[PDB]
Curated annotation (Swiss-Prot):
Listed name of the protein: E3 ubiquitin-protein ligase PRT1
Residue span relative to the full protein: 303 to 366 of 410
Segments forming ZZ-type zinc fingers: 4-59
Residues holding Zn(2+) 2: C24, C27, H49, H53
UniProt: Zn(2+) 1 binding residues: C9, C12, C34, C37
Length: 59
């Protein structure tokens, strides 16, 4: 299993993210989503992270 030690999902709060992790390119603090949240975010927006922000798979 792919376990992203150190990273939690800023939509649902799962920590660590297991499986795919999407990491915000624009976000300083940092902003991460799990696969389930990324394939539906949320209140998932606030702060520094706007819907204008793009995320990419963490590799
Ligand atoms: Zn999530
Ligand atoms: Zn962001």
């Amino acid at each position: 299993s792919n376990v992203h030690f150190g990273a939690g999902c800023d939509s649902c709060g799962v920590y660590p993210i297991i499986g795919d992790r999407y990491r915000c390119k624009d976000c300083e603090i940092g902003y991460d989503l799990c696969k389930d949240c990324y394939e539906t975010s949320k209140p998932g927006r606030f702060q520094q992270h706007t819907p204008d922000h793009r995320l990419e798979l963490a590799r």
